[PDB]
Design a protein around this nucleic acid. Sequence first.
DNA 1: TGTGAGCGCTCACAATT
DNA 2: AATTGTGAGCGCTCACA
Lengths: 330, 328
Amino acid sequence: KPVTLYDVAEYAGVSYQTVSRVVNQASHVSAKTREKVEAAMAELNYIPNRVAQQLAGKQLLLIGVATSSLALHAPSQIVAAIKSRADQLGASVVVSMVERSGVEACKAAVHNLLAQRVSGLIINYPLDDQDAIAVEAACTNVPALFLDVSDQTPINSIIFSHEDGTRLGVEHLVALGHQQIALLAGPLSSVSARLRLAGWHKYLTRNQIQPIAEREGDWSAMSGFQQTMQMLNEGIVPTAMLVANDQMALGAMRAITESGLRVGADISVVGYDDTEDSSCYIPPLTTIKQDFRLLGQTSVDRLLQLSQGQAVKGNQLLPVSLVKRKTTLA
Amino acid sequence: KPVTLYDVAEYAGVSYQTVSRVVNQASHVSAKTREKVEAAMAELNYIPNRVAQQLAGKQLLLIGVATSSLALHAPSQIVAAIKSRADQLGASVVVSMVERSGVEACKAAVHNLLAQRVSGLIINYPLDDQDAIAVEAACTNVPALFLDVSDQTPINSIIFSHEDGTRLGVEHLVALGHQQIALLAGPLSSVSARLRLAGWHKYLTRNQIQPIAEREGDWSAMSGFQQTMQMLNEGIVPTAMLVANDQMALGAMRAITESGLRVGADISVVGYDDTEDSSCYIPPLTTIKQDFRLLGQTSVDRLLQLSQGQAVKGNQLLPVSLVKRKTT
DNA sequence: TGTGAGCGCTCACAATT
DNA sequence: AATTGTGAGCGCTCACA
Ligand SMILES: O=[N+]([O-])c1ccccc1O[C@@H]1O[C@H](CO)[C@H](O)[C@H](O)[C@H]1O
Ligand SMILES: O=[N+]([O-])c1ccccc1O[C@@H]1O[C@H](CO)[C@H](O)[C@H](O)[C@H]1O
């Protein structure tokens, strides 16, 4: 037994709609009849049923999110900012976390987000061009925002400019004098992983450079260590490395270190993300800064824009920037 | 206007209650008329309004979570597993984040988590005893399970055994022949931080040892850094630290190293958490394994047991380990 | 395999002063 | 021209021609 709108009606000697009228801060209640209702809602701890209100047709803002596992670093900070900017403007956010692999798994997360009748979907799951389109199709009537697709994918999306990110990493190493460079890509299953790899290649090629090695991790610090050992042990030893995130950069550094040479001097490392923890690596990691707050922030503002039918369609690139630290010098 | 049950009624040639049995799979395998309704709903892509299902009274188990900012390590990881184990059981979960400081914030979080009509909530927010009680109260008719309160707090709680963690660490550093030990604790605002500090004090005393330094971090590596630097610049130079988490430990190590001394041999370190990244710190960091996935899994099971009446009231401690690494 | 309830609200607005 | 009370029904599930 929870407390109905009707209950406040009997205790306060008014109708139900006049409680609704007050709960909804609506015009026309004489201000002295308000006290009767305002006092009655206390003395009953009345919290109005939002399930009842949604159905009734209250225009609340409800943003759905289909997200990669919150255990990973970046999808987590994004949800947090998404969540934060919701409250900031009176929106609520239900988030279905895609855990299993592939297009069908993500579609179900879109399916039961649609169940709860969301005003629009933020899709932070990695989707290839066609599957992205497949999913955006499934968002029937509701606008959908994509955060882990390519800029070439012909839907709406926010991505950090991986072009800029890699340009900075490449043009740095290159200006520094490096030529034997190795690449440590993210897991190829991720779009963003692939884009950064692509990017490095473009700007290396534009500088007449070919990476001596190129291998793949899973974002994890351990992989980046394993991968930079599998490399160094084969005897391929670059003067610099481009890593696809700070955690794997960490791994590489460890491997580079345990291998008997010094980070920066003997092998420079450029990370990717600029995490909290990256300013306290040994030595403190040079990286490409991605403002996940800003992403989740805009990610919301846009979905709500799109929800209202504002002309803000397609792709937009967020800025990145190079954090110069101690892993590239002398 | 989206697809209604009243719209599958005069397209498949039946009623509303017939489509209701199809998606529910409740009692009868209603002939070859199922085939007709299957192809009917899938043609217009009908998705049963879960808001209408709920108001109606569908016995779907919906958990609420009031949680510290997911940007921090431990909380994210926990919801990560809370969201997972509930999914494993066919429970959905709505999380509500506390950013603002204090009790009134968490009270409000609980308030708008009740509107969504959860059938019990997991409170992963740091709460002093009387506030924890006041929060549990506001959870009208619904069971609360607290995750960032003390063992002594008289509500439902799962916490990791801070007693064991802090034993493990102290009892280990000491067996390595250490007497000049320092402490780096969590931001004192967090209960679990204080539980850890306390367990350290407890066991360091049981071993006739006074800590030569006590400094307060904020979970961040930067704080763990400058917090160890501002102590080493004072002149205090232990041979071991006990640190509240792997992350501040990280900054400690930076600080120790950048100063001019070998992490491990000159000043050993013990972190707390066993984060994925901890195994690749330079050198790999000794720490206390705190199985976040476990905690989030068990939380969800308990709130469930709690919701149905299965009487397992009170407090529950979870095991920890010492991953013996290379900073000792 | 159908019909007539009611869940807690918000919207029309018609009814009270 | 101030107010408030009263009539739908939003979508679905529950118990029984
Ligand atoms: O993959 N992304 O959609 C994405 C969006 C914003 C910033 C980075 C990028 O996320 C990437 O995520 C992976 C795990 O999913 C790792 O956390 C990696 O460190 C991060 O850069
Ligand atoms: O504070 N906790 O509720 C808690 C539960 C399980 C394990 C550790 C402990 O979490 C602690 O949380 C803080 C930030 O929330 C840091 O992430 C720290 O590393 C973690 O140990």
